[PDB]
Amino acid sequence: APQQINDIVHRTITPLIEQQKIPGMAVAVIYQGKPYYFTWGYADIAKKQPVTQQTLFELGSVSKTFTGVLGGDAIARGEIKLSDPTTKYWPELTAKQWNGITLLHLATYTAGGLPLQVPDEVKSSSDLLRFYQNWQPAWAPGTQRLYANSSIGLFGALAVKPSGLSFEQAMQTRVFQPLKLNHTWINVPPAEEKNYAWGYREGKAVHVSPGALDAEAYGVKSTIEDMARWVQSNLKPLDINEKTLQQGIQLAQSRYWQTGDMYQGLGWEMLDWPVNPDSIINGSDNKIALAARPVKAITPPTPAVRASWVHKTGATGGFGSYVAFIPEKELGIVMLANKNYPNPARVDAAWQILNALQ
Numbered sequence: 001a002p003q004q005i006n007d008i009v010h011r012t013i014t015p016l017i018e019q020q021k022i023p024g025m026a027v028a029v030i031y032q033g034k035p036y037y038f039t040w041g042y043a044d045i046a047k048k049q050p051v052t053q054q055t056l057f058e059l060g061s062v063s064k065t066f067t068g069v070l071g072g073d074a075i076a077r078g079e080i081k082l083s084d085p086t087t088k089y090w091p092e093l094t095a096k097q098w099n100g101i102t103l104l105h106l107a108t109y110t111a112g113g114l115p116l117q118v119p120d121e122v123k124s125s126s127d128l129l130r131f132y133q134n135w136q137p138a139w140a141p142g143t144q145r146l147y148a149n150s151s152i153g154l155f156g157a158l159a160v161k162p163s164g165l166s167f168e169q170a171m172q173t174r175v176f177q178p179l180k181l182n183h184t185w186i187n188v189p190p191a192e193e194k195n196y197a198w199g200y201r202e203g204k205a206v207h208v209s210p211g212a213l214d215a216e217a218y219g220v221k222s223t224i225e226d227m228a229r230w231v232q233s234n235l236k237p238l239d240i241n242e243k244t245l246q247q248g249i250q251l252a253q254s255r256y257w258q259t260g261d262m263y264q265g266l267g268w269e270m271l272d273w274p275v276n277p278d279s280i281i282n283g284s285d286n287k288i289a290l291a292a293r294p295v296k297a298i299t300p301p302t303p304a305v306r307a308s309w310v311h312k313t314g315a316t317g318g319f320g321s322y323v324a325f326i327p328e329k330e331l332g333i334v335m336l337a338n339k340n341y342p343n344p345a346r347v348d349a350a351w352q353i354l355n356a357l358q
């Protein structure tokens with residue numbers, strides 16, 4: 001399997017694993033549309049279980065790409081509109097600060113300062129209502145971007161309401177099943193527990209804890225194979241036979257807002273290709289990525305641009321993931337690890353690999 005891919009991947013990932021003390025890692029390169037897989041180290045150090053192509057990793061915020069596409073699919077189905085008020089789908093949400101906050105704002109972190117995290121103390125449905133009712137925006141809608149689980153988490157929950165399906169049922173039936181992502185889960189079933197890697201934080205084995213709107217913002221677990229197939233599907237949506245899903249994928253990669261050289265999609269973030277590597281690498285740092293930044297509205301949104309670097313970083317306490325692809329070039333990468341190591345190290349590695357193959 002072509003020596004160039006082997007050498008480029010190994011020369012980049014070996015030092016990375018060494019420098020970052022990553023216990024286990026899986027990488028897929030999609031090259032001319034076909035996947036090539038690489039694995040290192042341990043899914044479970046104590047039980048000596050190796051990382052394989054069937055190992056499940058916590059995607060953390062890479063989950064938002066699925067939420068975005070599921071939202072796009074609901075738009076394509078005519079179930080929701082991004083221009084609709086949040087209150088259309090949550091009538092109990094009567095506080096006046098919600099006037100003018102649309103599903104677009106929720107999906108794209110531009111509601112006006114919804115927090116990074118839903119508070120841990122928010123457990124019940126009543127707690128959730130109270131939280132959003134009592135939330136006071138720092139900014140007018142559609143003026144500042146502040147990356148937030150509480151923002152896209154709510155979008156995900158509201159997007160599926162007209163369907164009558166739970167978020168998990170909607171995701172399963174409308175995204176996972178059609179794309180044959182048969183080892184991708186919001187809740188890992190007992191049958192698949194043997195494949196579920198431990199995450200490692202400060203040397204301790206850890207898994208993500210339950211939280212409000214977790215499924216919607218950070219709750220997906222997947223294998224390197226399914227994630228490669230996810231990249232393939234997002235690289236080439238016209239190959240997808242389910243029409244609403246094909247359209248949903250395209251809607252997720254539309255450009256809604258710009259800040260600096262990045263464009264906000266639904267879950268996905270995009271930059272023009274060719275990229276300045278410094279820009280994506282430094283920009284991935286959560287110093288920049290989690291900062292409040294002014295946005296320029298793209299009125300109307302630009303349809304998915306083929307000459308894009310399309311990507312998403314994501315983490316949990318014990319895992320670090322990165323996905324990136326370039327539609328123009330039929331080129332992509334997935335990097336899954338059971339340590340949460342710094343974003344810029346991920347993106348640097350990804351750049352080196354894809355730039356060498358481009």
Ligand SMILES: O=C(O)c1ccc2c(c1)C(=O)N([C@H](Cc1cccc3ccccc13)C(=O)O)C2=O
Pocket residue numbers: 060061062116117149207208209217218286313314315316317318
């Ligand atoms: O272990 C957990 O329970 C857990 C759950 C969700 C996220 C994380 C951990 C997590 O690190 N992230 C980040 C974003 C994030 C969310 C919430 C608080 C954060 C604090 C510092 C850095 C990133 C955070 C990501 O996906 O990159 C998450 O979105």
